[PDB]
Structure formats: C-alpha cells, structure tokens
Amino acid sequence: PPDLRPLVPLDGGRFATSDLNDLYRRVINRNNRLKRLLDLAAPDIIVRNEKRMLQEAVDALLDNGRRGRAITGSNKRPLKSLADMIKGKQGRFRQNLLGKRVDYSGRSVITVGPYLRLHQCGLPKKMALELFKPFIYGKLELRGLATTIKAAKKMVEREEAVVWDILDEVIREHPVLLNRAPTLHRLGIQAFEPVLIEGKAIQLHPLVCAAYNADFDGDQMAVHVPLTLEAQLEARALMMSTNNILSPANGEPIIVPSQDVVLGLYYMTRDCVNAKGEGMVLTGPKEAERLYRSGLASLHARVKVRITEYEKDANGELVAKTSLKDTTVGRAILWMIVPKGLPYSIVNQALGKKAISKMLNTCYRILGLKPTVIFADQIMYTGFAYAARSGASVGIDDMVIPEKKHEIISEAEAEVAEIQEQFQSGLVTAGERYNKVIDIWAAANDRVSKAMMDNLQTETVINRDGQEEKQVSFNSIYMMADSGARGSAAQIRQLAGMRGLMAKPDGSIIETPITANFREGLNVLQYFISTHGARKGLADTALKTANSGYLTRRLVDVAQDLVVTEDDCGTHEGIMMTPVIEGGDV
Amino acid sequence: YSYTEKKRIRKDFGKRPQVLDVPYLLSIQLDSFQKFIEQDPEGQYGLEAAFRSVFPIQSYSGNSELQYVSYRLGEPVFDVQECQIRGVTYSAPLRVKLRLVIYEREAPEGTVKDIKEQEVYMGEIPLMTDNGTFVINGTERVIVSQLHRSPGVFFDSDKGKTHSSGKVLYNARIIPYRGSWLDFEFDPKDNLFVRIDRRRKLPATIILRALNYTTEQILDLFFEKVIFEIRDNKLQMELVPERLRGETASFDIEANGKVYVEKGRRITARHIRQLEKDDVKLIEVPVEYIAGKVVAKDYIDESTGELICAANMELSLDLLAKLSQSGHKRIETLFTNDLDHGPYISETLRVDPTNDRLSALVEIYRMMRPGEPPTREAAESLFENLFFSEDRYDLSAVGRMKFNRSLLREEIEGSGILSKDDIIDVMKKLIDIRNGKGEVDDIDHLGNRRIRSVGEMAENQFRVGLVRVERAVKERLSLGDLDTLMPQDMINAKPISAAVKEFFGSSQLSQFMDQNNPLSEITHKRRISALGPGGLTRERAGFEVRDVHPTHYGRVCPIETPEGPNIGLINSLSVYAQTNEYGFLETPYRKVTDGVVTDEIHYLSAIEEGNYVIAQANSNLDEEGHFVEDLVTCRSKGESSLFSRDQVDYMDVSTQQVVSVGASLIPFLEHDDANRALMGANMQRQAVPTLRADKPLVGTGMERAVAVDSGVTAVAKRGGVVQYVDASRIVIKVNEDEMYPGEAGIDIYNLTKYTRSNQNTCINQMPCVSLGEPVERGDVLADGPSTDLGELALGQNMRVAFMPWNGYNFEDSILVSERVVQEDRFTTIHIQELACVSRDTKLGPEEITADIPNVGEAALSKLDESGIVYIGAEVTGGDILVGKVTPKGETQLTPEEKLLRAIFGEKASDVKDSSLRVPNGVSGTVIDVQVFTRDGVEKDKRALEIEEMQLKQAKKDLSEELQILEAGLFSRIRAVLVAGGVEAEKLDKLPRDRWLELGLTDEEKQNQLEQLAEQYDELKHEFEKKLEAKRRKITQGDDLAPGVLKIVKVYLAVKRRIQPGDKMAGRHGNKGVISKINPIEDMPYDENGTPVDIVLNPLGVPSRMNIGQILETHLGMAAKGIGDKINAMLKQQQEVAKLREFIQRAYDLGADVRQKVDLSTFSDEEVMRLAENLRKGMPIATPVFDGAKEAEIKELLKLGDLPTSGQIRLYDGRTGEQFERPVTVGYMYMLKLNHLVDDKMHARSTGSYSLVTQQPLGGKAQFGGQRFGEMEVWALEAYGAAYTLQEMLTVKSDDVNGRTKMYKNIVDGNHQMEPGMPESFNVLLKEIRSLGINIELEDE
Amino acid sequence: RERMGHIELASPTAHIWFLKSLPSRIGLLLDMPLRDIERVLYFESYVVI
DNA sequence: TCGAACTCAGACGCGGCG
DNA sequence: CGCCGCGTCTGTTGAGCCGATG
RNA sequence: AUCGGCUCA
Ligand SMILES: [Mg+2]
C-alpha cells in the first residue's frame, strides 16, 4: 500500500521518496514496452532482449545485489530493496520490533548526594513536572480548582503554588525506574522512590554505584515511570533497591562500602601510644563520646571501658552480659551502632575493608534483612562524618625515597659491566649474556622495593613514659594503601622506588630498565619507552567490547527458552563432584 | 625586549641554552598551496605541470591542433569579510592563453593556413585565506593531510596462510601511483605464481613467455649452466673449484692424471685448495653423472631438425649417443640444489600449459575479459595498454627512486614505465630472498609512508577534469569547419568546475574547523590522518598499524591521539618536523666534529637516521668542549645504550622535539603517567572562552608563540605611534623610515566585535594599547577571544585545598564555593542563528508582512511596519520573529459576500500563515538582523534602512582615510603655498579656500597655482570615483538559489553560568562534575580569615599516578606569595628604590638559569608599571622536560614567608574546630568544558509520532522519547516482571486505541490497561506477504 | 495502509530466493546443475522439454 | 556507461578433480 | 576417499552536533 | 530519510 512507502514533501517543492517507488517504475515501464513489442510481432532479437531486461528489473526489485551488480541510484549508492527492509541491524526484526521507542521518559547527568537513604533518589522539579502530567490533571479536576482541561493546562504552565502542592502529593509512594546503558546484567535497572529537589541533575545514592558501574565524571542516566497498578506493585516487590543485595552469579553481597567511608572507619579504630587520657576508665560509650567531643581525650588513645553485649545463643531470644573491655575511644564510639546481636570482637581491630565486609555479612546471617539495611546506611553516614573530621591530604613530602638507593644501582651497574667484559672476551655466548643481565636487574629491583617498604610502614618512632617505641605509621600514602581505599603495593613502588623493566611492542623485554620514578622526574627516552606499553593497553581496551557484546548476544539467544516448569522430575542418578586442587595446592 | 615584553616579564627556570627557535607553526598548508598555484617557469610544479601534461591536442586524422601557452588568475570580486557575510565562495577566475593553428592536408606540412590567438575562461579555483583555511559557501573549512604507502616495490612474508602446513610463504608486490598492481607469490610446495589485480592465480613464467621470448633466451638469462664435453669416448666436466662446497661425493673424485678425493667423502675446504693448486678444470667422469641432470640449451638433429631435447628439459643416456652423433661435443646442464638453486622455475615450466606467445596472450585475454573474441589486435592491445602505456600506467618521480634503491642499482631516475629487465630483477631477488639471502621489509617504518597534502590532491582532481575535457576536444576538432572555428567555442568549462567544486566541499577530508580556542585551530590544521580515498578503514586496520614504532622519535607525537574506535589512525605532527622534497618526514640535528658539538644543523630523513649514532639533549655538555662523562647515552639502529666520547656524530637540537604543541603546554609533564597525560592533552582543546580571560600562573614558556601564530590577534603591520584608539577601531601613524613615498602612511584596523563561531560561541576583540604610545612592528594591538596581552590564557586559576569533605566529593566530584559564582568568573556567551526563506509556490509568491490572519494583537507589539523584530527586544520561547503568509487556493463566490467583504473589507485570497517562531526552550536578546534580496524584487523599507546605514559608515571610513591622507597632503598643500612672499596676518585671516587668488609673480608661480588647481582636480576625481565604486558594490543586488525571493536572518544571544551537574577539568587529566554550591560560611578558612574556593579529593592521586598536580599546586602557592608582598609594598605607598631592589631580588633565584634580567636599565615609570602588572601574582615558566626542581621551588616558598613543607592549618566552617592534621593549599589552573547541563536534560510525556510505523520520534531537537533497546528487555525478563514490559511494548509505544484509552483512564482516576497488537507487527506481515509468501495467522 | 494492488506480467519470471539462495530449491528439485538454469534464464541457450 | 576497486579475516559448506 | 578451490555471512550499546543530496 | 565526519561514558 502507499502509506507503507510514503512520499514526503520538502521545504521547496522537492519530494523525498523511498527507493521502492523507483524500483516499481522501472518494472512498470519495462512491462508496458514489452507488451507493445509483443503485439506487433517484432523480429526475434528485440523480444529476446526485452524479456531479459524485464527479468532483470523484477529480480532487482526482490533483492538488489544478488544476481549481478547492484543497480545504483543517483549517488553511486545501491538501492534499498524489499529483502533489506527486514535484514541487518536496521531492519524490522531488530531495529523496530524488539526494541521500541518509549514515551513517559527522560535522561540527564548524574551526581552524588549522601543525605539519602538507599531506597531514594532525586528528581529535578521540572523533569518531574513534565513526566507526571496527567496525574496532576486528574488531581486538580478532582479537587475542583479547575472545571475543564484547558483550565488545568494554563494553571500548570503558569506554575501557581497549588501546582507544587498537588505535585508533591502525586509522586508520594510512586517508584520510578532508573537505567544506565549499557545494561550488561539484571542489576542494570532498579526501582527507586523520588525526592524532589531543584537543579538539573539526578542525584543518586553512593552505595549503589558499584552495581551500576557508575562514576561521577560525566555519565548519563535515564528515567522511566510505571503507569498501571500491577506494574507499580512489581516495581515495589521485585526490583526495588533494598530487595536484591546478593548477586545472582554467586552469593557475594553487592553493597561493599567503597572508597572514602572505609578510610573514616579505618582512621577511627586505630591506636597511638601516647595520645592523652591514657589509661583512665569510663562507664560506657556515651562518656567516651562526651570526652572526645569536649576535647579532653584524643580520638584514639587506649582506655578500658564497661560494655554490655547481647548473645542470643538461647532458643531464639536474647541474653545480656556485661564486662570491662580493653579498647580505645574510637571503637567505643563505634559500638553505638552495632545492632544488639553481634559480639564485641567485631570492632576490636583496625577495620580494613575486608573487616567491614565481614561485619555486614555477619549481620545478614544472624539478624535477617531489615537490620542489615539500617546498619549499612549508618555505616555510610558515620564513615563520611569521621573521615572529613581528620583532614587527610597528600603532599610532596609523603613520597619517601629510600636512603639506600645509590648503592644498589651502582652495584648492579658494576655487575653488568663485568658481564659485558666477559662477553667481549668471548667466554660466554650471545643469549647467555642477555639472560644473566635481565636476572641481575630484576634482583636489584626487588631489593630496592623491599628497602622502600621497610622504610614506610613502621618508622614512626615515638616515646611515652620512658625511652622509645616503634609503631605502625601515619603517612597519608600508607593509610590510603593499607586500609584498602585506593592503590596497592605495586603502585606505591611506581611512585617511590624503581619503576621496573619495560617491554617493547613485539613482546620482548628491553635490556636497560627505567631507573627513575615519579617523584624525581624521568628522562626523555625513558618516557618515550613507557609510551609503548601505554598505547598497547589503550588499543586493547577499545577493541574487546565488540566481540564481547557479540558473544553475550549469541548466548542469550541460545539459552532463551528454558524456564523452570515442574516440581520434581523423578529422575535417577546424576553426576559426581570431587575437588580439583590438583596440580598444586587448593 | 620588545614593547609587549616590558609590560610583564615571565620568569624562566630553564637551564639548557637554545640553538634553534620554533618555526612558523603552520607552514605545511601555506607552502603546499603556495607551490600549487605559482607560475613555475621550467620545473613543473602546480598548474603548469597539469597543462603541459596534455601538451597540444591534434585530430583523429591529424589535420590541425591547438597549443597551450600560458595562464593567469584574475582578482576576486569580493574580499574575505564580505565573502563570509554574503554567503558565497571565495575564488579566482582562471584565464588561459591559447593558439589554434591549421595545417593543410594537401601539403605534407602546409602549416601556413590559419593562426588564431586568444584567451579562454575555464573554471574558477578557491584560494587560501591568509591563515590556512578555505571559505566555501561562507563556512570556514580546513582540509587535512594524508599519510599513505609509498609507491614502489615491496617484499614480505606471510606466516603460512595455510597454517596447517606451518611453513612461511614469501611474496613480492609492485604498486604504482596510477595503474594496476602486480603480485608474485609462492605456494606450499615451491611453485612461483603471479596475479594481476587480485585476479585468479596463474602459474608463473606465463608472463615470461608473454614477452614473446621462449625457453632458450630468457631461461639462459636465468640460470648460468654447467659445462661438459663428450670427448668421443666419455664425459668430461669442467669444475670451477668453488662449486663443490658443502657437498658430498658419490664416487672417488680424481683428475685426468691423479686421484684427489675419495668416495663417500664431503668436499671440505682443503679439497678445493688442492684442486685450485693443481690448476685443473677438465675432469673425466662416469656418464652416470648425466643420469639425473637436465639439458640447458636446445639441441636438435641438425639434419632433420628434430628437437633432441628442448631447453631446460630432462635427458637420458641414449640421448648421450644422440648428442654425440648429431655433432654435439659439449653438454650444458643445471647446477641444481634446492638449498642453493632449487628448480622453482623448472617446476613452474613443467606445470605451464603453453608453448608460444599466442597461447599465453589468448589465455590472459579471455581471462580478464571473458567471452569477447580474442582477435590478434585484441590480445596485443590488452597486454600492451595494461602495463606499458604512459597513458594508463605511470609510476612517479618518487616511485622510480624507491624502486631503483630497493634493487641496489645506482642511477636514481629514469623512465616512469615498466619494462623487461625490471620484472626479471624482481623475480631474481624474490628467489634470492627465498634461498636465505637478504630479508623482508616492514610496513610501519616512517621511511615507507608518505604525506600528501592540499597541493597534490587538488592537482590530481583538476587533472581528471582536464582529461575529461580533452575527450570532447578531440571529438569536436575532427569534423566541422576550421577556418571560422574560434577555439573558445569548442571547450566546455563545466567538468573542471564540477570536479574542483566537488572536491573542495564534498570529499572525505574537507571538514569544519573547530573554533573553540586558538588550540583548536592550530591543532586541526597540523593533523595527519590515515583514512580517506586510498587508505585504510576503521575496521580493516589490525593491531600492527595502531602501535608506536621506534622511528616516531621526532616526527610524530606519541601521546596525542583520540580514544574512540580510531586510536592510532590519526596523530599530530611534532614541533620541528619539516617535509622532504619527495614527501618523507625530516628532523633537525647538530653536527659533532672531533668531540666538539658544532653549531651547524643538518636535517635527516627516516632512513639515514639509522646509520649514525645520536646523542641526547640531557647529556651534560661540558661548557663548549666535549661531553662530561665517559659512557654517553645514545641510540642507534633503533636501540639505546652507552657509547664513548668520540664515536658520537649528532646531538639533537632541543629538549622538546619529541612532543606536539598540544602537549608541550602542560607543566611538569615529566612527572605524570602516559595515558593520564593523553587525557589532559586531549581535553585541553575543549575549553570555552569566558568573559574576562586570565593568564596562567604556571606555564611552559610556549604560550606566546601559539597565541601569535594562530592569527586571531591583530598584530602591528609597520612601526609607528598610536593616533586614535576606540572600542572598535584603531588608527596608527607610521614612522618616517617605514613610509614609502606614495601615500600619507596611516594604517587602520577594524576590530571584529561579537560574532558567531561555528560551534556557537562568541568571537570578539579588545584594544590593548592606550592613546599616544609607541608601537614597534610585530607587537599585538588587540587581544583575541581567549588571549591576555599576547599570552594564551585558556581558563582561570583558583585556590584549591584538597581533603575529603562529608562525601560531597565522593568519586571525582568537585565542590565549588559560592563566590566563584558571584564574581562571574565562569559565565560565557552563546549566540545562535535562525533563518526564514520565502519562495514562489505554484499558486504564487509568499510575502513578509505584519498583517497575519488569526493572531491576537498581543503578539504583534514587537514587530515594526515591515514585519521584523526590533533590535534589542528580548524574546522567550514561543514568540514571533518574522511575519509570513502563504497564499492558497482561490474558490469563487457569490455577489452578496462580495458586498459584505467589501464593507468589512478584509481579503481576496484567504491565506495560510507560516511565520518563524522561537523553538521552545530558547530565550535571549536579538542583536543583529540581516536581509538578502534578489535583483528585481522591490526593496522593503528596512533593508533600505540597513543598507543606507552601512553606506554611512563606509563613507565615513573612506573620507576619514582619504582625509587623513590629505591631512598630510594638505599640510603639504598649505606649506607649498607659503612660497612667493608672506601675508602673515591675512594668511589665516581669510578662509583657506581663498589661497589660489592672491598676488602672482610670473617667473615661476603660474606653475604653482596651476599645479594647485591640477592636483586638487585629480584628488577630487579619485574621491568621487572611489565612493561611486563602493556604493555600487554595496547597493548591488544578490544571487540566490532558484525559486527564492528574499531571506531574512535573525541572531540571539544568551548568557550561561555555573550550576550543579556541569563539568570541569584541570590540565593533567582530572575530570569532574560539580556537586554542590556551598555558602561562604561553610568553606574551610585558614588561620587568617580567607576561605577556600574548591575542595578536591586526595584519593585520586595514588591510584592514577598523575603527580603533576601536587607540584603545580605548590608552585601556585609560591607564585602568589610574591604578588601579595608587592601588593603590600604598593598600597602602603613605600618608594621606588625598594620596589626595584625586591623585584630584582626575585629574578635571580635559580641554580643556573639562563634568563638574566637586569633592571638597573629600566626607567622609573617603566618599573612602576611593571610592578603594577605583577600585583596579582608573579607568573612563572617551566619548559617541558627541563623543568624546575624541589630545591628551587622551596627557595621560592621561603622567600615569601610561607611554610616550606607546603601545607598549612585549616579550621572548619560550621563548628569552628580545627582539622586534626595539616592540609595542602595552593593555586590550580582549571577550565570550563562545553558539556553543559542545559544541553542534556530532557523529558517527555506525549508528543509527535512517526508516519510509516507509528511510534515516537527521537532526539531533543524534535521532542522525542528515549529508547528501550533489547538489552533492557533481557534485563526486564530476568527479574520476572511481565506486566511491565507488556506495558512498554503496546500501550506506551504502538497500540493506538490502547494509548488513547490509557490516557483517558489516567486522567479519569482509574489505573488500568487495554492492550492490542503492536501495529508495526502487521506492517511486517504486509512486507513479507508482498514478496509472494503467504504469511497469515490462524484463528481460534 | 491496508489495500494492495497487482501488476500482471506479460511473461513469467523467476523468483530469486527460490533460485539463487543456497541449495537452489529448483536445481535440487529438477536435479540439474545450477549453471544450466542460469544460462537458460539469462537467455543464452535452449533446452529440450 | 573508462572506472573503480583493494591488500578485513576467519569460518563453513559445496562443486570439481582426481 | 581426499585435496583443493570458491562465494555467503557474521563483527557493543544508549545519546549530541553540522554540513551534503533528493 | 539516507550518507559522510567530529565527540561523550
Ligand atoms: Mg565514567
């Protein structure tokens, strides 16, 4: 029919039409002219050629570039047959029938807000005033402020305060769906509950950025609303944010506290050897709070307090026991949020992020779900608050070069010179010299790194009530690398010791290694050699995603159908499981 | 020190003396085009090659011909600015000189019949503006260089395509500039193969027979044989001693009269030694030695003529009798061994079905053109015009050089066409590389890739146009009259114009020029792409091309490239790189002579760099002598090591020719990682020019060159002293020495106020000099969009103090204060363009008028009589800009309504309206309205007003020019009159006009009065004719596309400022997205009252290792302390001597810096204005790899009384307590970026719908809904939700009845759903059942 | 959007999909090779019924 | 109907020929 | 049975912008 | 509506 192949007008009397009209005109003309030549009984060769040209016109209409060469349009581009309005990434089955466009939606730029609770998100005023329009019309007409629809249109556009009151009424208890593309796995879209703010950006909780894989440096996010009454209950009971906190790939929790809260939890619960209020006794966590806040005691200075802890070892009900424990002041501040079912030895340690994750998991095992949600949120709040209150900056005095670094490199160079001398006298072969040189450089690397880390970790020497003691350090780089916020040992080694040997594009290992680091600055061709590996990494990261996405598609398309249908199949024996520690250890 | 240097001197910390200074940043376009159009006399470059390559054309019969002579370019009708306002191309006409001579057919050379001589107009060619950009239909446009594989020969080896074999396969290739390729190849069992243009594989040697030369001659050329004699009894073989080598003996080798070598005995070196000491070559051998051999030369029965054995064929022992009896006393054979001389040619022969030339040509001919009969002419023509015609195959000037060099000939140049010897040599060296001699080439070498730029591309396109014309010239010349045929008639200028105007504006490489910065220009013009016509594609290119090669050192930047799909395909040219004469890249170096680094500089290519040994810039030169330390670091043959003090040959020039210009502007580049520096150098090009620009406190010395050479600031043309300065023009008066004696010597600069940049930002210029102060040639007189006193200043520098703060800077987020928004130091201007056109419909013409049917009087206050908005009225989305009505059908009527419509009196042709309106969501303040009209349409009132205004300004400018000209000239014409006596009291008493009438003396002064009158007359004639010319050019009607009557064009201008969600970033690659705007109180305040302005996050340094920003912060805080100290000295009004002493103390601080500024020379007012300019903070410089060190930066910090460590005590804003630990504080320099929020947020509830498939449109421009791709559908199936995607598949997208009834229910208070069928499904049903397939769905 | 039309061809033609798709579904039925069917339908030879 | 197109590449199944 | 050669068919997902042509 | 080009995560 026509409307399946329109002929759209232009600005200036021009017409843009699909290629189908062109492909049809050619066949119509060939048909008419061949009928003419057939009536008059023209000599044979005219009939032969005319019939063959009719053949070509038809079987170019069916699908263009198959039999011979494709019949191009004006622009040296092939035409669009019927059989390629169904194929490809642009056809019907994939572009227009499995994924629609959708209205009642919007998109914008994300940014953080830490005053939320993890079943909430922010909406700018005007996005929410554009999405929820008909609900507003209904409420106005029901209240009797507007008689007809046009009155409601104008009252909404002029933005009179009653509109803001009604809008605040409507969105209550009405979850929306937030999405971020690409959506690799089922935790990619979740159902939040709005809070209206002013601005232009969709605020979002911190803890649920690990599931989306979102960073706040320019990402974008899309918002949909559910209309009907069943879909609203589905967005509440199946895909809310507080209902799925175990990943379906493997039951490991998915709300690990990320990168800044952990440093606060790690700076509260640690011990100095001298601070103040050394060795006086308290009566509970509350007097510890009063003492730390009034400025009579330091946030971490070892003390002994009295605490009351609850175990529910009985038949499902709690029993209380009290005692004098030997702890700092920071841990006695934490004990105010652990929820009445946990032993006190959860807190007596310096809380790197493994300890925090165990803390949450143990709460989940014993007390169920709701206490875990409340407790996780309180951890986020207190971590932020007591991490800002310390002040923790990084300055060029923190990158500490080991003192014994001239000797190591000088010795290594002497050794390589001797091996070169022995080679030039012919005693040793070609490859043997190469191998011995790389081995000696690797050994020098290792002992430089070990000297560095023996200088960073435990070198604060401080004295109290006597002569001298050594304790673990308070060097900002070391706290950011030990607790687990950011970094690791290898990358501190990049910043302070030698930065290793570098490889050339072929894959070989170049002979003379880098020797300077990022505090001393490095030379010209040392930089020009780092560039090799840097570009190889960058070029690989950009050309995985193609066949990764392709593989995911093929898998989803094979495993599509299967669903769990019956209760018990009644079959007999299956397979057998044994450990696979084989080769080496476990 | 120039006159813009005594204003504000920037301190250098560099320590290496400089030998070569950076060249003109963008020479490559200018030189390429400039040698495209120049008139070369003899050495064809440019257009003259293109003509002289189609050197005269004769007829099919040869009865006449026309001969090309010369050419010239007219002058353009319009200068650039008019050509950009108007909306037309900027071009020049091409006028060619031609002669047609007619030579008679009766006489053999009766040339004296006719000689017609004239000029011919054909085509128009665009020109290059002064900077390097074309204008094409009014939008400035830039075309990018290309980097492709050099034409020539090429060897390599695939790693066993049939990899099951596991054996490498070699091959060779010939590729010319214009023609058809040629490939030679092996097969998994060693049989040579050829192929032409990737056709079917053919067994080789078929070319060898196709040269019409058979086994004998050519395959004697190929092998050189082994000599035998049949001495009437037996066989003797001649043994050259150096033949039996690495071999084994089958019987006891001996001589005619001695025994030499035993049986079963390999021929060691001593055996050859003995044989050559014995001087014996002829040796009797058993005839079994011939059992196994092969013949070499064809031997026949000399009586009958029967071939005993064709050349290069097998033999036997009865054939020994045959050869001896026929009269052959000698036998030539083959010295064959697969390890040395394998029978690859031999097997190739005994697989070829062929014997003579005719069979080979026939087979090829029906191969390439199957079907058509192979007549003798057809076969010969196909094989000649394929490889051996100068018309259809040409290598190059460069291809021949590369060819002859790769085969180790001697003579560089020769013929441009293939021949026999070349193919023979390619085959021989390919077999040679097979046997173990030599080795393959590689592709990424910058000695096999060539750059091709504007001049060459345009030359090729215009040659294509020329040959197309030559066709029709040959056609028409042969037939018609000759004696009355003027040449101008028989050309057509259409094809040249079509080809050229298609390439300059439709090709793969003509692009817009990103006008965000000065960086964006002079990085978009120095760019080297690898795509386009004749190159790769984003999917073909593998992993070998995208990688860094050891030959990029000093020719192409290694840390500058995009991040998307095309990583290594486009990359920017380095700082000092030239281009050779052929096209390969070149780099400077300094010559070393006997340990002394001399001063003369040599440029080196990409292949000669490998022979020598090169030092490095960081090698500590020992004060004019040789190098200090023994084992100087060097590099050669593409590897680095330690060498002596005498072996070195060259030392590279400057410490920074390895990097580009985009990435030599970031300080402390040497400290931070590679890919973080990539992100920094790649988002420094996206800043936005703010209101008032501010210099950077820490730069890398190369600000000034980029700001000047980018051609965006108005530079002085000739020296002088400023005459008149205004906000929109400056008039300068030249010195006497620089004035050539024609004119009066005034220059006039018209600055360009607010204007659109084709990324929708604001371009404007500000005068930079006061009134009455001198100006020397080369200075700057007007800062550009984003400069500051001639220094590139690209963003603003703020006090940052970074530490974690209540999680409002969790991941990369920022936290700006709220007096960064009060001071307006990040707002920007954005202007926008809207247009309205009126055409001629079939019914009739449109109109532009204020009487629009069916509009309330309210919206028509803001239109004048002519129906166009006022200037200055501020509009908001939805209003009217231009009032237009479109006539439509006229139906006929009855007399009664005629009476009525004549009383009420309103209309003849009830008429639609289609006026222009502001698309919703836009606002602003109109600032400029332009009106274009044809030549023949009556000019409405407002266009008349506008043109009259513009004439008024033009006449003011012209009279001012000619009037200050004649102010000098009238000082002259007042001085000259004074001669002839004095009338001192009456001289100025009477009006100056009455100076031609007073007392006259005969002997000379009649000539004086006569010349008064005369020069007045010519002056007035020049004035009037000049003004008439200008008025004619202004009032001139315009030209429009067919069917258009007149078009108006309206601008708008908004003002955007900071709010949450909006992006920022530093120079080192630390992005971020503002998170909160925080009152003044809450900002942490140091011990003295002053708060902070940004609060970054310290958890972002250790994990990405961009340690640049910490040191940059410390220098910031060091460089502001001195500014504060000068401010204190200067408000308190101290004295001059103290300022002199302190400032001189600040410029002598480094270890061994090269800059030494002595200001005991400066005069007192100059010192005072310098101290005025530094009171905001002393600027500092730090070249890229020769930076400042921690000792020097700490000496600075200790000069201004600041803590040496770098970090201070910060209190808190809300509670008044002290932060537990010290905190860093300093001055970062950070940038806007134009990923604003106001261009991203979008929201839809109901709107348009498509036409063919009935589901909502897409994109913000046309108010569409988002997309729910199949990945989200899988996500929503995994959960188990089934109602939700039924909702998203039918009643929000396609089901028509469903959506209307859903809206009804929602507004009615009932939340339910009645679904149907997505009607694009039944669209699919009809598309399938249209093919002849009966898709149709059963019923219940 | 719903009504259709038709052209009546003067002489029969051959559907591509049932000829040039892989194994031809015509050459498999008649059993004669593909090349013969093209060379008949390209108007190059005759064939005996 | 002359005018390009080029060195994607990896895998699979079929039509000829031994 | 076993090479050996030939024409189809695949290659991430959402968005933003501006020329070109009909 | 198609095509080419630049850019974001
Ligand atoms: Mg991101």
Author numbering:
A (entry chain D): 246 to 831
B (entry chain C): 3 to 1342
C (entry chain D): 99 to 147
Show the paper's wording.
RapA is a bacterial RNA polymerase (RNAP)-associated Swi2/Snf2 ATPase that stimulates RNAP recycling. As the only bacterial homolog of Swi2/Snf2, RapA (also named HepA) is an abundant RNA polymerase (RNAP)-associated protein with ATPase activity. RapA contains seven domains and three linker regions: N-terminal domain (NTD), two RecA-like domains 1A and 2A, two Swi2/Snf2-specific domains 1B and 2B, Spacer domain, and C-terminal domain (CTD), and Linkers 1 to 3. The ATPase activity of RapA is autoinhibited by its N-terminal domain (NTD) but activated with RNAP bound.
